[PDB]
Design a protein around this ligand. Structure first.
Ligand SMILES: [Mg+2]
Ligand SMILES: [Mg+2]
Ligand SMILES: [Mg+2]
Ligand SMILES: [Mg+2]
Ligand SMILES: [Mg+2]
Ligand SMILES: [Mg+2]
Ligand SMILES: [Mg+2]
Ligand SMILES: [Mg+2]
Ligand SMILES: [Mg+2]
Ligand SMILES: [Mg+2]
Ligand SMILES: [Mg+2]
Ligand SMILES: [Mg+2]
Ligand SMILES: [Mg+2]
Ligand SMILES: [Mg+2]
Ligand SMILES: [Mg+2]
Ligand SMILES: [Mg+2]
Ligand SMILES: [Mg+2]
Ligand SMILES: [Mg+2]
Ligand SMILES: [Mg+2]
Ligand SMILES: [Mg+2]
Lengths: 185, 260, 167, 134
RNA sequence: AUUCAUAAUAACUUUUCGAAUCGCAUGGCCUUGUGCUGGCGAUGGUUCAUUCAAAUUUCUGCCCUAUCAACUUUCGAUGGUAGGAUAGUGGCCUACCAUGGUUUCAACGGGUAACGGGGAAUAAGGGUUCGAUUCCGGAGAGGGAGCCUGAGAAACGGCUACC
RNA sequence: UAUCUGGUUGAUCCUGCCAGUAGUCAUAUGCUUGUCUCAAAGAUUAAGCCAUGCAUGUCUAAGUAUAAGCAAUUUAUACAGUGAAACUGCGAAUGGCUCAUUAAAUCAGUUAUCGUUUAUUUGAUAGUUCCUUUACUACAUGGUAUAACUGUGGUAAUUCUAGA
């Protein structure tokens, strides 16, 4: 008898299982952003639906309302901070007009590919999950790190990654050891 | 059933203790004392969660066995002693005093006071009666019985206890245009002056209190604690002065505090 | 193994609701009563051991009853019980005549004596006169508090009756 | 000379417990969670008190390594350090040994067996011997 | 708001309480007796407050069913008086008295794969279904019943009896 | 997250259900199961029955120490330290479990005690102790009666108990 640990679902399965248009756009976005499942689209669609209905229920209230100003501007600032909503178009109407790609372009897997450094979205995913990117002074192995526009200049190689230094790598050490074993000292 | 209860679980503790949901299944149940269970801060909560002088409850017991903590001039080595509103906590080590005043958010605030402030306290006169052998006495909000008071004192007034003797120094009367402190309700921790009060025959009278920022509100008189005249508080007020500005202006002071 | 009970005028066993401070039973909780079978007080062939106590010594000598005496285990621990034991007086000294027991540890000899209860010590007289002074000073403090409040009531009555007369 | 970079955030003086509390965060490159005993002797000359009066606990190093964050205490003297230190951390600092008691189930069994005997039990110890002998 | 707090008078009591208790320090004083006086507490203790409460209690709100429309009142049902019992109000019980009380606005009865609520699932809105179960309140310790001690139990890791 | 589709006919438009479809802190079961965090878990049928072990005991300078216990005492031949056992005080009426009863009953929100009890905590509180004193009973301080303890036993047995 403790306090219950809070948890919730972060995605929603679409109502129609087999629509050829929806399967087209899901697998288009899965290959475009190098995603693993359709769950990585459903989770982003869950965040669209939550913030869309939050802006919908707050646009229902009229202007100058303290609840509308507080919750609207906090969601506006959160979306501007993450970089989904741009510097302009800071309105809840544009929040209603947000799309799936506005969160897919802000992921660490997308961003590591986009500032060079990866040469592919799938190479960006495997560099992140093999601990080659430190965003600040902390390494990240989550492809959905969701960079928040204050870390873009600091998306670099990790200080403890063989690309970033401090180590020659495990398979390079074994290959160098075999060359030394076949050559001499 | 079958008798009094001795365990207080978490999620049943008072919310102003700000206790963690996790890290335990229970909360410190306050023992019997001068104040009610739901409206008092235990000494373990004041030391381990507010002062942060202790990491566990075992060392809270260790200071109280060392008798460093005392409230109202008395040691009170009990761990869950119910120190409440208008109670002074004196640590002779570090030469540090507090008064358990509320803040603007309705929680018990760490408000450090000087020694000439810790030399007295305010008490709201709960009831006035003639005791045995015809001796008048008053009972304050902390259960103190003070015999032979000045007969100008009525109920819902405030006295100033010497706190070194079971006597009074001076009293302040429940009238219009006096600083009052809200002790209960959702208006807890609001400071203002009495606009007027209503008679309400049958019970539960009401007091209209407006702030210095003209934020008028109403409160039951059970929650109203007179703490001085017009201005001039008998106690050093905590940071905030009980103004209760809206949350949009609150997030503005955070930007102003962050703006250096 | 059933003890015979005092006052059971029956030749058999019987179950009784035994309580505190009765025979054949020692309670373990407060107010606990338990039903136990006890042998009757009437002596019959069903007994195993009967307890006899001698109240009058006779002409002959037994092997192990009247020959051997057992030394007394504990002497009087209270001061008045010592005074009535040795018959000194109402007011004499007990510390001289405290019974002292010798303990030998093989190599070391040491002596032990009881804590003498209910003796008169100047600590006890200090505590006694402390409550005497406590009641005396409380009586003067409450009387002067009532006198100050009475003169405060007289001042308030004189002030209010002066204002009521000239208003 | 690994630039271990010892520092203490949120230092609070606690003369109530006659000690000082702080948060020990270290930055150890190319090295893991170095150990507690060189952190104790390092904090000894940090606060100029003594090696034995320094108590530390915590130090969960951050993910990706290089940085360890933990809690630390410096006591005014070792005598009051022992008075206000938990006994599990005495044996962590070598100042005491584990008091060799029985297992918890065995202690409960001993108490429940000792509940049956009213008194010392010396007369029943000789009584069972006399009952078995004769 | 009181026949309130409190006081006074006359009394009454298988006469309540009003320290024959413990630790540490032991200062000061002169009728120099181990004399007078004194400190810091602990445990107690009558009563009034306080707190933890408990007990009862005011209004309003509960699922399905009429193939359940009349129910309650012998063995209290509704009220009055008086008493008893209770910690205390009260048909709570007793004695006397009156014939009342509930009901189609669903009484009473039956069923519940009924502990109540805070809550949960689903859901555009309105709703539907669930809630034994991390919190609050209740009830029980195989079924009943009775009781001792205790401030508080009709206690079951207390007792007694029957099944 | 304000959505429908297949099936009556030779064909049509309907009513209408069947069937699909998507969730369930909603259970069971099949197949499969590499990593980290988090954690429901004998409720449903049987509040059916239970082997065994544990879950309630508690001592500070401050009630009682002649353990024929230990260190031995720390003017210390009354004791003084620690201290098993046992008298004494307090707790054991908290908790934990379960939901079988229970349908204005519990319960919920809201009222009352001017209709009551309340250990403990906290504040205050007691010069009168004079039986019918013109008859007080030791206050530098009344009494016994017991545990633990010693010794004699009973019964196969129990946290059973007797006599001294
Ligand atoms: Mg590595
Ligand atoms: Mg009567
Ligand atoms: Mg009556
Ligand atoms: Mg009758
Ligand atoms: Mg149900
Ligand atoms: Mg049921
Ligand atoms: Mg439930
Ligand atoms: Mg019960
Ligand atoms: Mg009790
Ligand atoms: Mg029972
Ligand atoms: Mg049991
Ligand atoms: Mg129980
Ligand atoms: Mg259908
Ligand atoms: Mg791993
Ligand atoms: Mg069931
Ligand atoms: Mg069962
Ligand atoms: Mg319980
Ligand atoms: Mg458990
Ligand atoms: Mg269970
Ligand atoms: Mg008690």
């Amino acid at each position: 008898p403790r306090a219950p640990r809070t948890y919730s679902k972060t995605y929603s399965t679409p109502k129609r299982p087999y629509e050829s248009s929806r399967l087209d756009a899901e697998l288009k976005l899965a290959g475009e952003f190098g995603l693993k499942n359709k769950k990585e689209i459903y989770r982003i669609s869950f965040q669209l639906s939550k913030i869309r209905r939050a802006a919908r229920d707050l646009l229902t209230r009229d202007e100058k309302d303290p609840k509308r100003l507080f919750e609207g501007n906090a969601l506006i600032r959160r979306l501007v901070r993450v970089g989904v909503l741009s510097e302009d178009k800071k309105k809840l109407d544009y929040v209603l007009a947000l799309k799936v790609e506005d969160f897919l372009e802000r992921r660490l897997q997308t961003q590591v590919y986009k500032l060079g450094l990866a040469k592919s979205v799938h190479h960006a995913r495997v560099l992140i999950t093999q601990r080659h990117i430190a965003v600040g002074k902390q390494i990240v192995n989550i492809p959905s790190f969701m960079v928040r526009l204050d870390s873009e200049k600091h998306i670099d190689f990790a200080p403890t990654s063989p690309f970033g230094g401090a180590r020659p790598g495990r398979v390079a050490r074994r290959n160098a050891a075999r060359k030394a074993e076949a050559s001499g000292e | 059933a079958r008798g009094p209860k001795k365990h207080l679980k978490r999620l049943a503790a008072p919310h102003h203790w700000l206790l963690d949901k996790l890290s335990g299944c229970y909360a410190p149940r306050p023992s019997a004392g001068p104040h009610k269970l739901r409206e008092s801060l235990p000494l373990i909560v004041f030391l381990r969660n507010r002062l942060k002088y202790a990491l566990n409850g075992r060392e809270v017991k260790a200071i109280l066995m060392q008798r460093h903590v005392k409230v109202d001039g008395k040691v009170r080595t009990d761990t869950t002693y119910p120190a409440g509103f208008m109670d002074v906590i004196t640590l002779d080590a570090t030469n540090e005093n507090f008064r358990l005043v509320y803040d603007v958010k309705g929680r018990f605030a760490v408000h450090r006071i000087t020694d000439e402030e810790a030399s007295y306290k305010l008490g709201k006169v709960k009831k006035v009666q003639l005791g045995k052998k015809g001796v008048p006495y008053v009972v304050t909000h902390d259960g103190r019985t003070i015999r032979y008071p000045d007969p100008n004192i009525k109920v819902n007034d405030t006295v100033k206890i010497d706190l070194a003797s079971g006597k009074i120094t001076d009293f302040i009367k429940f009238d219009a245009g006096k600083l009052v402190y809200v002790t209960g309700g959702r208006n807890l921790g609001r400071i203002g002056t009495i606009v007027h009060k209503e008679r309400h025959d049958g019970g539960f009278d009401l007091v209209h209190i407006k702030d210095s920022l003209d934020n008028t509100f109403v409160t039951r008189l059970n929650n109203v604690f007179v703490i001085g005249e017009q201005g001039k508080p008998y106690i050093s007020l905590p940071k905030g002065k009980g103004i209760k500005l809206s949350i949009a202006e609150e997030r503005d002071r955070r930007r102003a505090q962050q703006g250096l | 193994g059933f003890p015979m009970k005092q006052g059971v005028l029956l030749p058999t066993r019987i179950k009784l609701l035994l309580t505190k401070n009765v025979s054949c039973y020692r309670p373990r909780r407060d107010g606990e009563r338990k039903r136990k079978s006890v042998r009757g007080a009437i002596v019959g062939p069903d007994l195993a051991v009967l307890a006899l106590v001698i109240v009058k010594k006779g002409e002959q000598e037994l092997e192990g009853l009247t020959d051997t005496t057992v030394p007394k285990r504990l002497g009087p621990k209270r001061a008045n019980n010592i005074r009535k034991f040795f018959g000194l007086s109402k007011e004499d000294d007990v510390r001289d005549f405290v019974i002292r027991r010798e303990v030998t540890k093989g190599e070391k000899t040491y002596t032990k004596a009881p804590k003498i209860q209910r003796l008169v010590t100047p600590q006890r007289l200090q505590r006694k006169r402390h409550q005497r002074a406590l009641k005396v000073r409380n009586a003067q403090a409450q009387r002067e508090a009532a006198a100050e409040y009475a003169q405060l009531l007289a001042k308030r009555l004189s002030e209010r009756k002066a204002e009521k007369a000239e208003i | 000379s690994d630039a271990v970079t010892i520092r203490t955030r949120k230092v609070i003086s606690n003369p109530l417990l006659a000690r000082k509390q702080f948060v020990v965060d270290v930055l150890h490159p190319n090295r893991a969670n170095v150990s507690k005993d060189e952190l104790r002797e390092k904090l000894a000359e940090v606060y100029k008190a003594e090696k034995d009066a320094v108590s530390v606990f915590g130090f969960r190093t951050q993910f990706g390594g290089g940085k360890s964050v933990g809690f630390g205490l410096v006591y005014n003297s070792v005598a009051e350090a022992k008075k206000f230190e938990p006994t599990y951390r005495l044996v962590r600092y070598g100042l005491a040994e584990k008091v060799e008691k029985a297992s918890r189930q065995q202690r409960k069994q001993k108490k429940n067996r000792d509940k049956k005997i009213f008194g010392t039990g010396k007369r029943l110890a000789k009584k069972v011997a006399r009952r078995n002998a004769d």
